[PDB]
Design an enzyme around this catalytic site. Sequence first.
Site, PDB file in Angstrom:
ATOM      1  CG  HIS B 366      -2.170  -0.869   1.085  1.00 34.79           C
ATOM      2  ND1 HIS B 366      -3.380  -0.559   0.631  1.00 34.79           N
ATOM      3  CD2 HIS B 366      -2.223  -2.176   1.502  1.00 34.79           C
ATOM      4  CE1 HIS B 366      -4.177  -1.607   0.758  1.00 34.79           C
ATOM      5  NE2 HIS B 366      -3.462  -2.576   1.271  1.00 34.79           N
ATOM      6  CE  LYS B 557      -5.906  13.938   0.893  1.00 34.73           C
ATOM      7  NZ  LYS B 557      -7.050  13.213   0.354  1.00 34.73           N
ATOM      8  NE  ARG B 558      -5.696   8.725  10.616  1.00 38.64           N
ATOM      9  CZ  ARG B 558      -4.727   8.649  11.532  1.00 38.64           C
ATOM     10  NH1 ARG B 558      -3.858   9.632  11.728  1.00 38.64           N
ATOM     11  NH2 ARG B 558      -4.667   7.575  12.293  1.00 38.64           N
ATOM     12  CE  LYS B 563      -3.503  10.945   3.253  1.00 38.65           C
ATOM     13  NZ  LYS B 563      -3.308   9.587   2.725  1.00 38.65           N
ATOM     14  CB  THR B 665     -10.137   5.278  -1.643  1.00 37.69           C
ATOM     15  OG1 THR B 665      -9.610   5.516  -0.360  1.00 37.69           O
ATOM     16  CG2 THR B 665      -9.435   4.047  -2.259  1.00 37.69           C
ATOM     17  CE  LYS B 669     -13.765   6.907   0.609  1.00 34.42           C
ATOM     18  NZ  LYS B 669     -13.244   7.407   1.856  1.00 34.42           N
TER      19      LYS B 669
HETATM   20  C1  LIG Z   1     -12.044   7.020   2.320  1.00 35.62           C
HETATM   21  C2  LIG Z   1     -11.541   7.537   3.656  1.00 35.62           C
HETATM   22  C3  LIG Z   1     -10.181   7.751   3.856  1.00 35.62           C
HETATM   23  C4  LIG Z   1      -9.194   7.755   2.667  1.00 35.62           C
HETATM   24  O1  LIG Z   1      -9.019   9.065   2.087  1.00 35.62           O
HETATM   25  P1  LIG Z   1      -7.740   9.385   1.204  1.00 35.62           P
HETATM   26  O2  LIG Z   1      -7.996  10.703   0.610  1.00 35.62           O
HETATM   27  O3  LIG Z   1      -7.482   8.234   0.370  1.00 35.62           O
HETATM   28  O4  LIG Z   1      -6.457   9.559   2.137  1.00 35.62           O
HETATM   29  C5  LIG Z   1      -9.736   8.186   5.074  1.00 35.62           C
HETATM   30  N1  LIG Z   1     -10.635   8.450   6.077  1.00 35.62           N
HETATM   31  C6  LIG Z   1     -11.977   8.258   5.859  1.00 35.62           C
HETATM   32  C7  LIG Z   1     -12.965   8.527   6.984  1.00 35.62           C
HETATM   33  C8  LIG Z   1     -12.428   7.796   4.664  1.00 35.62           C
HETATM   34  O5  LIG Z   1     -13.774   7.565   4.504  1.00 35.62           O
HETATM   35  O1  LIG Z   2      -5.123   1.145  -0.493  1.00 37.74           O
HETATM   36  C1  LIG Z   2      -5.895   1.970   0.369  1.00 37.74           C
HETATM   37  C2  LIG Z   2      -5.048   3.167   0.754  1.00 37.74           C
HETATM   38  O2  LIG Z   2      -3.987   2.677   1.582  1.00 37.74           O
HETATM   39  C3  LIG Z   2      -3.096   3.687   2.056  1.00 37.74           C
HETATM   40  O3  LIG Z   2      -3.800   4.508   2.946  1.00 37.74           O
HETATM   41  C4  LIG Z   2      -2.483   4.579   0.932  1.00 37.74           C
HETATM   42  O4  LIG Z   2      -1.845   5.680   1.537  1.00 37.74           O
HETATM   43  C5  LIG Z   2      -3.582   5.092  -0.031  1.00 37.74           C
HETATM   44  O5  LIG Z   2      -3.001   5.748  -1.126  1.00 37.74           O
HETATM   45  C6  LIG Z   2      -4.446   3.906  -0.505  1.00 37.74           C
HETATM   46  O6  LIG Z   2      -5.472   4.317  -1.381  1.00 37.74           O
END
Ligand SMILES: *Cc1c(COP(=O)(O)O)cnc(C)c1O
Ligand SMILES: OC[C@H]1O[C@H](O)[C@H](O)[C@@H](O)[C@@H]1O
Lengths: 831, 831
Positions: B366, B557-558, B563, B665, B669
Site C-alpha cells: 500500500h 483525509k489523514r 498529503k 480513495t 468518493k
Molecule cells: C475514504 C476515507 C479515507 C481515505 O481518504 P484518502 O484521501 O485516500 O487519504 C480516510 N478516512 C476516511 C474517513 C475515509 O472515509
Molecule cells: O489502499 C488503500 C489506501 O492505503 C493507504 O492509505 C495509501 O496511503 C492510499 O493511497 C491507498 O489508497
Amino acid sequence: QISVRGLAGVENVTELKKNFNRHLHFTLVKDRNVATPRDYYFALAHTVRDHLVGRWIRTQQHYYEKDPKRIYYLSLEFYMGRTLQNTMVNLALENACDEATYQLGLDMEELEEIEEDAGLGNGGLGRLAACFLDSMATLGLAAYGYGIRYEFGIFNQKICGGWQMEEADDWLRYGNPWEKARPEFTLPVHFYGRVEHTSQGAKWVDTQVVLAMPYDTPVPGYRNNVVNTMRLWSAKAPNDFNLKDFNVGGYIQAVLDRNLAENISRVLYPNDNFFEGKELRLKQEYFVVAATLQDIIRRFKSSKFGCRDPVRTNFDAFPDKVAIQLNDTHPSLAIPELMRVLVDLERLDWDKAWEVTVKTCAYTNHTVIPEALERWPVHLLETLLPRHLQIIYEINQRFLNRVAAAFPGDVDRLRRMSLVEEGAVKRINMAHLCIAGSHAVNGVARIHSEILKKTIFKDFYELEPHKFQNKTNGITPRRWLVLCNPGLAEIIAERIGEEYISDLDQLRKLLSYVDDEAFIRDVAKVKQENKLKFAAYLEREYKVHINPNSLFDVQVKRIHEYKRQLLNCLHVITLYNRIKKEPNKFVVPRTVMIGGKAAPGYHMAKMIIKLITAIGDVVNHDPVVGDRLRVIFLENYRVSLAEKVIPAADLSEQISTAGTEASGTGNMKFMLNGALTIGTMDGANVEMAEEAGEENFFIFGMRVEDVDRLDQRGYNAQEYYDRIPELRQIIEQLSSGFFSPKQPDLFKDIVNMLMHHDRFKVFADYEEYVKCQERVSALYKNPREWTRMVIRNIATSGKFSSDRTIAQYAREIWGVEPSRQRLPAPDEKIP
Amino acid sequence: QISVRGLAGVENVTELKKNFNRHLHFTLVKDRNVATPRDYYFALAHTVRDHLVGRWIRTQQHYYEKDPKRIYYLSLEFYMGRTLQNTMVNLALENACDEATYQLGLDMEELEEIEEDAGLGNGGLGRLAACFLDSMATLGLAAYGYGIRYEFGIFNQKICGGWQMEEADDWLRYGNPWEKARPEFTLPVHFYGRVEHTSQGAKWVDTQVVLAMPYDTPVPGYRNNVVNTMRLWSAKAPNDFNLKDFNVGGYIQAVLDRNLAENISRVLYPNDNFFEGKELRLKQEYFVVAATLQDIIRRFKSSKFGCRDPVRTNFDAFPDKVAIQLNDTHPSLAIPELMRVLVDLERLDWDKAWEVTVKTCAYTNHTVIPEALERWPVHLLETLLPRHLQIIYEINQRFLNRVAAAFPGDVDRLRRMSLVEEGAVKRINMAHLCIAGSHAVNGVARIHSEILKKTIFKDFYELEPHKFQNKTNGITPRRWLVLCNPGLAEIIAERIGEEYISDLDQLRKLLSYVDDEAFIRDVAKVKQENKLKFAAYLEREYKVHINPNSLFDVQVKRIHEYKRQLLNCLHVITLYNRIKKEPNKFVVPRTVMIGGKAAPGYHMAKMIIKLITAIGDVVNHDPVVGDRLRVIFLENYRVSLAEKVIPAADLSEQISTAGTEASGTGNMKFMLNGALTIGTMDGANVEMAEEAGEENFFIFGMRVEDVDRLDQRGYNAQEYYDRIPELRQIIEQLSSGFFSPKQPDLFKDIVNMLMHHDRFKVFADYEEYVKCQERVSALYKNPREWTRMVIRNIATSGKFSSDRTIAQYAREIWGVEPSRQRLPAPDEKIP
Ligand SMILES: *Cc1c(COP(=O)(O)O)cnc(C)c1O
Ligand SMILES: OC[C@H]1O[C@H](O)[C@H](O)[C@@H](O)[C@@H]1O
Ligand SMILES: *Cc1c(COP(=O)(O)O)cnc(C)c1O
Ligand SMILES: OC[C@H]1O[C@H](O)[C@H](O)[C@@H](O)[C@@H]1O
C-alpha cells in the site's frame, strides 16, 4: 402427574415451543443441525425470561404510581446460584417447559445442568441475601438488592494431589441471559482528592472519577406477579482524564491503564469470616455505597415530592420513604456517605441530617469472632476518602459526648466505645459506626443476639437498649424444597396441599401423619431415590463409587477452625480404627462426605482439606473396611451442588464450638429435606431443637457456659490426650505418617495446633461427640423410627422460612407490611 | 415517491412496526413512556438485523453444501462506519423502515445519527477493507473478513485551544447489535516458549497461551440474499496458568493480571502510514494470523475431504480450496505460520509445504514511503515467536540461493534482496517475506504498481516478473452514492434505471444528458440541497456559521506531510492576503474545510492542525474579508462524517507530492458525488483524469520525473522564497506571529522544516497550484459550465467501483468467478 410443577397446558406448550425456535434462530443465530446442548439451554433461558419482562415492567411502574416505602438491601454479596429452574418454579412454568422441550426432543434436566452459577458470594452471608431477595418479592415488598457485578465470583476449587487448586470463575464467559445492562444510568463515584473548607461548606475537590454502570437482574416472587430488581454495579473508566490528564506517558498506555478503574469490580474477595484490610476492598466498599445512594436519592426526589408534597426538598420524609438495610459492616460507609450528601450537597444542618440518617439505616451483625471484624486503618481512609474520615471524627466526637453525659466520669467506657481505636496503627471500627448511625442492630439467631448484648456490644446496649433486636435467619422453601426436592414437596402436597410453599408453618399439619404408614414409606422412599440419584451423579461427574445403602453423613460449609471439620475428621479415624481392631463385628455403614472451600490464604483450612483427602486415601483402600466406611471430599461446593447433596443426606454435621456460629443456614436446609442433625447448642441449632424438641435431635457437647468455665480455668488439651487412649492413638497416627507415608511430618501443624493453640477446643467435645454418633447409628438401624423422627423435623421446620424472617424485618425494623397479594396479571400492555 | 429506497409495502410496514414494539419491550425491557431516542435506535437495529439472520444462515450452510474456493481477507483494519442504513439499503428495507417509524411517530434520520461508528481502521487501508467486503458479498464470493475486535477503535479527536486532544473511543459502551459472540469457537494462540529439536521434528514448547474468541458480524451484499461473515477475534486469558502457575504472588493479583493477555485486543494503533516497532503490535499481528489459520484449516479438513476425496489429508488441494489475501504486511506472519503448521504439525516436507504456502498467499502493497515499512528487530521475533524466526531464516536461506543461481556473482543483489537486514540492530523486512511467499504482489493504482517494479521491488521484479500485478482501488457505490447521496442516485435513476448500483459502468450513459437542461438543473439542485444540509449540521452539531453560496473547498483525509495540508494552508493565506490588499475587488467566495486526524505522536501533523485553526482565528474574524472567505477545521473526521461532507463538496483537494499517495480513495468518493478535483498526477488521480479526460480535471504540478529531476539537482527552498514575493510574505507572517500573537515563535518548526528539510517539496508546486486555483474559481463563476464538467466526472466514475476491483482480484489473483446471482430467497426454514 409428573409432580405439581404447574399445568403443562395446550396453548402454552405450543407457545413455548414456538418461542424456543424463534430464539435459537433469531437470538442464537443457529439452526437445529449445529445447535449443541448449550445453544438449547440458551433458547430456553431466553424463552423463560420473556415471561417475566411483562411482570417486571408492570411491577416497577406500579411502585412508581403508588409510591410505597422502599427497601434497599445493601450487601457486598449475593450468592444466587443458577436462575432458570427458580424462575420456572416461581412463574408456574416448570411442567409446561418440561413437556415443551420433551416434545422438541430434549431433556430439560440436561439443559439445566449447563447453566453456570452466579457465585457472587462466599457462603452464609451472601446466600442469606439471595434467600432474602426471594422472600421480599414473595411478600410484595418494594425492595431492591444492590451490590457489585463481579466478573469473577468465588474461585472454582480443584483438588490436585489432595490439595486445593484455586482457578478463576469466568461465569460470564458465555453470557448471562438474565441481566439487563443499563449504561444509560451510569453514575460517577469519587476517589482520593482533598477537602477545601470554603465559606459556606466543605467541598471534596481533586478527586479521581470511576463510573459505576448498572446491570439489573429480575427477582420474581412465588406465583404472585411481582418481579423486583437486583441492581449490580460495574466499574468503568471515564474516557476524559483516563486519557486527558496530559503531557506524556503514552496514548496506548493511557488507554491500557483504563483497567485500573475497571479492576474495582473484577473479583470477589474469597474470605468467609475473616477481614483483609486491602485498599481494593475498601474501593469495592465505597463504590457500591456511593453509586447506590445516588439511585436512592434520585427516586426520593421524584416520588410525589418532585411533583409536589410540601414543596421544598424536605428530607424529613426521607425515612418514611427510604429504609436501607446494611448486610454486615461491608456497606457501613453508607452512614458517612448519606451524611456527606445531606450536609455538603443538600445543605442540611448536622443534627437534622443525623436524625434522618439514623432513622433510615439499620445494621445486621453476622459474627462475634474478632478477626472477622472490619477495622480499617485511618491512614487508608485519610488518603482515599478524606471527607468521610472527617464526618466519622465528628460523629465520634458527638457520640462519645452523649456517652460521657450518660456515664459521667466513666473514662474506660469512653475509650472502649470509641469508633477510633488507638494503638499500633489507629483504626476506625466499622461495627461501632453502624450501631451509632443505625436505629436497629440485630443478630441472626436468638443466642447470637444475646451474646451481642452481653459481651461484644454490651456498652452499646447499656447506652441504647432499644436498638438491639434479634431476627433469626431463614431459608426459602422455593429453591430449598420445591426446586431441589420435588419428590418431597409432592408427597407433602398430596396430603396437605400447596399453600405451605408460601406459608411454611403449615408443615405442622404433617405431624398427624407421624404414624401414617403410607406416609412413613413415602418419606423413606424419596430419601432413597435422592440417595440413588446423587450416588449416580457422583460416578457420572466425578467418580470411583459409593454405597446408597449407607448412612450419608455430610458436613458441607466453608472450611474453618470454628466450624470444626477436624472434630469430624477425628471421629472418622476412630470408626476406621475400631473396625481395624474388630474386623468381623458389624457396624452401620457410612459414606461421610465433607466438602467446602478454604479461602486461598488460610493455610490451616488448606491443610484440613489435605487431611480429609489423606484419611480417604487410607480408608477407601483398606480391604478389611470394604464398603462399611468411605470418606469422600466433595469438590467445589457451591449453591448448585448443595441443591444435590442436601436432599440425599441422612445426617447433618453442625459441629461448631458453642458460641462461634452466629446462626448457620445449612442446618435449616437439611432440616426441611429429611436429614437429622447431630450438633452443639450453637446458633440457630438451639431454636431448631426447641422447635422439634430435643428428643428429635442429637445434641452433644459443651454449651457456652462450659466453654467460658473452661476458659476461666484454662483449656489444656494434653489432659484430653492423657485420659483418652482412642484420641491418643489418632494423634500419634497423625504424628508418625500413618496417614502421610512418604511425607511423615506433613501434618505437624494440625497436631501442634490441636495440642497447643486450639482456639475452638476440639478435644473437649470429642468424647461426647463419638458417644452421640454411637446413638445415631443405633437409630439408623431402626428405619421406621428414623423416618418417624425425620417427620418430626420436617413438620416443625417452617419457623425457619425466610418469609418469617422478612415479615419480622419488615414489621419491626422497616415499618412496612407484607402482602401475599397477586399483582394484576402480566397482561400484555403498551401504553 | 421519497426516493427509490425500496417499496414501503402494506404487509411489511405492519410487520416492521410489530417487531419494533416486540424488541423495545422484550429486548430492551422498556415501555414507550421511558424510551429515549437511543432505545428507539436499538429497537430498529434489532428489527432490521432479524431480516438478515435468515439469509446469513442459509448463505453459510450453502457454502458448506456446495464447497467453493474460499477467500480469506486478512487485515488488521476494517473501517466499517455505522451499519443500520447500509443494511437497510442492501436488503431493500429503507423506505418501509422510513414509513414504519414515521407511523410509530419517529424520525429514522434522528435514530440513525445515534449509532456509533465501528472505527476499527485508521484511514485508507481499513476503509478499502470495508469497501472490499461489501463488493465480495455483492459478487457472490465465499469470502471472509478476518481481523481483531478492538474494543477501542481510533481515538475521537477534540480540538482544545486549537490543539488536538485525543480521547478513548468506547464504541461498545452501549452495545453492538450487529455482532454475534461465538465463545464456543475459541482457539489458543501461543507466545514465547522455545524450540526443542527432537528426533522427528522441532516442537514449540513452554509457550504462554492466550485464547482468541470469535465475534461474527454479517456482511450483506446488495439485493442478492448473500450475507457473508466478518470474523473478529477478542483476546481472553485461560483460567488455568493465568492463575495455576503456582507458589505465591497473590490470588487477587493472579486474577487482576488476566488483563495482560486481554490487552492484546484492547486498542487499535493510531498510525496511518508510519511503523512503530512496539511488542504489543507484533502480538496483535501474530494473534489474528494464528487464530485465523486454525479456522481456515478446520474448514478445509471438513470440506469434502473430511468425508472422502483421495483420503489421506493431502494438502495439495489446499490452494484450490483456499486463497488468503494479505492486506499490507501486517498479517505477513501468515507465511511462516502456515509453514509451521504444515511442516511441524501436519508433517509435510519443506518443499511441498512451500509450494502450497506460496500458491495460496498473495500480498497487496500500500505505500512506498520508507517509514511506513515493517522491519521488525530480530531480538523481538527471537523472544516472542522463536520457531517462526527459524522458519524465516530457512525461507531466506533458500530464496537467496535461488537468487545466487540466477544472478551469479551478483553479491550486492544478495544483500539487497535479503529478508534479513544487518546493521545497528538486525531486522526482518516483512515486505520481502511477503513477495518470497506469495504468488502475486499488487499495488493499488497503475503508477504505484509501476514505481514498485521500477524502484522499491525492482530486484524482486527482475527475479520473478510474473508475480507483480496492479489492481486499482475502488469505492462501493452503495455507501458512497446510494446511502450518503440518495438525491443524486434518484435523479440518475430517473434517467438511466437502478442497474448501475451493481453495474457502475452504466454511468457512462449519463454522458448523453451533458446537454440536457433538466438534468443540468437537477444535478445542480441536489448539490445545492446537500450544501444547505451540511451547512445546517454545522450550526447544529458544532457552530458559528458558514455561507452555502460559496465554493466548498474541502480536503479531508489523514494529516500527513506528504498529503500536503500545508500546501493548502499556503494557498489560503494567499487568498486572505490578496483581499487585504484589494478589499473592494470581487473574488469568488469559498468556505475551505480541512479535516482529519493526526496520529498522537506525530508532532508535525499536530502542529499543522494548530496552523489551520490559527489561520481560521485570523481569517474568520477579519471584517474586511466578510463572508468572502472562511477557514473551517472539520473536527473528528471519520466515516460517518465523510458521508456528510463529501456530498456537499464542490472542490476536492488531492494535493500529494507526485509519487507519494499510492492510490487514494477519498478522491474517488468525491468524483461520483459531483465534486471537481484539483490535483497532482499522483495515485489514482492519473486514472481518474484519464477516465474523465484531462480537460475535465484541474491538474497541476510536478510529475514524478520532475520530482526526481529536482532530487538529482538538489531541492533548495530558499530559491522559491527568493523568487516569489507572495510566498515570501506568508513565511515572514508565520515567522513573526501575525498568525500567533501572544506566542510568536509558535510556528518556528513548520517554517524551519519548509525552509530546510521539506521532504515533500511544498514550495515547488506553490506557483502552479495558486495559478490552478485561479482557474477553478473562474469556472465556478459559470454555473452551467461547472455543472456540465461535473457531469463528465460522474458519468465517467464507474471504473472506480470496488466491484470492478474485486472482480479482477477474483479473476487474476484468486482464480474464482464473480456472480451477481440472487441466492434462493431468505425463506424461512428449519431443518
Ligand atoms: C475514504 C476515507 C479515507 C481515505 O481518504 P484518502 O484521501 O485516500 O487519504 C480516510 N478516512 C476516511 C474517513 C475515509 O472515509
Ligand atoms: O489502499 C488503500 C489506501 O492505503 C493507504 O492509505 C495509501 O496511503 C492510499 O493511497 C491507498 O489508497
Ligand atoms: C447455605 C450455604 C452456605 C451456609 O452454610 P452454613 O452451614 O451456614 O455455614 C454456604 N455455602 C453454600 C453453597 C450454601 O448453600
Ligand atoms: O447470616 C448468614 C450467615 O452469616 C455468616 O456466614 C455466619 O457465620 C453464619 O452463622 C450466618 O448464618
